[PDB]
Every structure is written in C-alpha cells, then in structure tokens.
Amino acid sequence: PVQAGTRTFIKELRSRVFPSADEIIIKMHGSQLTQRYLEKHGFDVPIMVPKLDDLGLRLPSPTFSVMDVERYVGGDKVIDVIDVARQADSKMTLHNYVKYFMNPNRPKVLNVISLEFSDTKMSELVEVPDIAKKLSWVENYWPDDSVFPKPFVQKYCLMGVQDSYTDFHIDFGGTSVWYHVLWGEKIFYLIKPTDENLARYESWSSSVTQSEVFFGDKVDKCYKCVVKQGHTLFVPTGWIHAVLTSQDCMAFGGNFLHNLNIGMQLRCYEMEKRLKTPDLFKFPFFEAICWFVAKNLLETLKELREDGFQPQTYLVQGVKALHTALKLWMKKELVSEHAFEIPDNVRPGHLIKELSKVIRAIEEEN
Ligand SMILES: O=C(O)CCC(=O)C(=O)O
Ligand SMILES: [Fe+2]
Ligand SMILES: [Fe+2]
C-alpha cells in the first residue's frame, strides 16, 4: 500500500505525466476577468492570470518572508498544521512552525493552509482580487443587522515545505477560490465535477482505503496545473483537486460563493453533510446566506417579470436550485435542524411561495 503524503507516494506523483491543465484552463489578463465576461462565457473551468496587473490584488513583495508573517501575525496564535506523511491534523504556534520552517534539517513534512489573518495586523498588507469581491455573496448580500457573524474566509496565508501534499477534495461549501504564489511553487491536480466524477469522489471519501487509493486514477482525466511564482489561479465551483508543494512556498488565497453556479454550490454542500466534513465548520451559516440570496434573486426576477423581460439562463437555473434547497430544509421532519439558520428578516413559508410562482411563470411564459 502506498499511503498519501509519504515519500513513496510522492515519488509516484512526481513521476506520472498527467494531461496538461492547458487543455482546459483559460489564461487571461487581469482586465479581461470581469463579472460581465463570466456571466456570458460562464465560470466553469479554472482561469489562470499570469501577471497580477489589473486584478486589484495587492500584497507584500516576493521578499516577504515566513519570519515577517510571524511578526505581523504573532507567533502566539495557535495554528492548524498538517503532518503530511500521516495525513493528520496537528497544532502549533506560529512561532514554532517558523522555527521548524527555517531549520535546514526538517525531520518531518508539515504544511500550513488554513491560516486566516483578516483579523490581524497582516491584513492591511493584503487586498483580494476585485473579481472575488465583486462575486462574493458575503460582499453583496450579508445584512449589517444579522445575529449571525460574518464569515472570514477571504484571506488565507499558506506556507508549506517541499513535498507537502493535500489530498483531493472539494472546497468547503462548494466555494470558488483564488490562489496566488508569492514565491516557491504549487502543483494543482484538477478534476472536472462531472456527475460521474462527483459520485466517485463521494464514494472514495466514504471508503476506508481512501488513503491508499489515488483518486486521480478513478477518473478519465486529472489535469496537472503548475502555479509558479507571481501567478494567480481561480478555481471554480465543485472542482476536485489535490495540491503538491514542489518547493518551499508561500501563497495567499480566499474562498467565495457567487450567483453563477448556485446549483453546484448546493450539491457540494449537501454532499459535505452526507460525509460530515469538518471543513463545513468554516462556513457555519451557509444556509443563512442562502436565504439572503434567495430574497435578492427573487427581487431581480420579480422586476424583470413585471417589465416583460426574460432572465439569463444561469439565473433561472440558480434560483430554481435554491428553491428546491429551501423547500427541502423546511420539511416537517427536518426543519428542527435548519430552523436556527433561518434569518429573522425572512418569511420562510412565504419566500418559497413567491419563488414557486415566479418560477412557474417563467417556465410557462416560455
Ligand atoms: O496548498 C494546499 O496544499 C491546498 C490549497 C487548497 O486546497 C485551496 O486553496 O483551495
Ligand atoms: Fe481546496
Ligand atoms: Fe462569499
């Protein structure tokens, strides 16, 4: 058995020659990446932006070190660290990790991918891509008067040593993500969320041998995408991926929900419940925001309707998806676990009704 994360597993991973990510990803300029563009062409595949020009992405120069991160963040903060060889979660202090990171003789391969710092002094040193902020649900529909706290999943600092490996997974809540390498290099293994691939992934996740079975071998194509320094990668909803730190690296990233692929976002969330993924603890109120969005998307439609216009395809599909989800969460035999997530500004029974007819119309009036 070849265990994920081990020196042996890495020998095989580094030797396989996967189909190039160039077969599917789109490379564009920071200026080309607009909400307008996405709403027409769709956001169904990874988008690569080689130069950060025009992304609105601001961050410390290529010399920003791991030592600086400890200063700006505070070596005291306890962080989640990954023992890659054992594919297990550990704990440490930003101080001890840096000490480990800088020692030339690393006795083990440890990785940091969950350090959220928007609540620290290192936050001012970073501004996320404008596109991410334009699409982000939290950026557009989160009321300043809710009881639920606003989620901080927009700024992560990643620091991994050579050969750190994150096994295949789908980002929490089915969120999209942006990724930038300050220095070093990351290698992404990307799998398209085809119905076949999603079923198989959920199967592989709920099987004991998951760690001895390379998921890349269970699908038709596993695209190798090399993210070199200065590059920014945008991974869309539901994409299954694994990442390998080919060399000591520091990168930044963030997660965001949007109106383009609501169907896939709802499918990935429901799957993550079925597998009881500890990751979902990062978007505790995914359902709360879904109600907020439904109210807004209902409005947009009510308008286009009362003025004789037909909505864009993705918007009907998306709203129709929210409809099923909201209705499922209200079932008498289930509402007891979803209830607390219903905002006090929304009338559950009523909203699901307004959605029902608005969808009824569009479907019939077409
Ligand atoms: O860097 C890693 O090892 C994993 C990163 C990742 O999965 C992400 O940004 O969505
Ligand atoms: Fe991920
Ligand atoms: Fe968001």
UniProtKB/Swiss-Prot annotation:
Segments crossing the lipid bilayer: none
Binding of substrate occurs at T166, K186
Q: Where in the cell is it found?
A: Nucleus
Q: Where, by residue number, does Fe cation bind?
A: H169, D171, H241
Query: Which residue range or ranges hold the JmjC domain?
Result: 117-273
Show the domain comment.
The PHD-type zinc finger mediates the binding to H3K4me3. Binding to H3K4me3 prevents its access to H3K9me2.
Q: Give a short account of what the protein does.
A: Histone demethylase required for brain development. Specifically demethylates dimethylated 'Lys-9', 'Lys-27' and 'Lys-36' (H3K9me2, H3K27me2, H3K36me2, respectively) of histone H3 and monomethylated histone H4 'Lys-20' residue (H4K20Me1), thereby playing a central role in histone code. Specifically binds trimethylated 'Lys-4' of histone H3 (H3K4me3), affecting histone demethylase specificity: in presence of H3K4me3, it has no demethylase activity toward H3K9me2, while it has high activity toward H3K27me2. Demethylates H3K9me2 in absence of H3K4me3.
Stated family: Belongs to the JHDM1 histone demethylase family. JHDM1D subfamily.
This protein is called Lysine-specific demethylase 7A
Q: From which organism does this entry originate?
A: Homo sapiens (Human)
Gene symbol of the encoding locus:
KDM7A
The stretch of the full-length protein covered here is 114 to 479 of 941
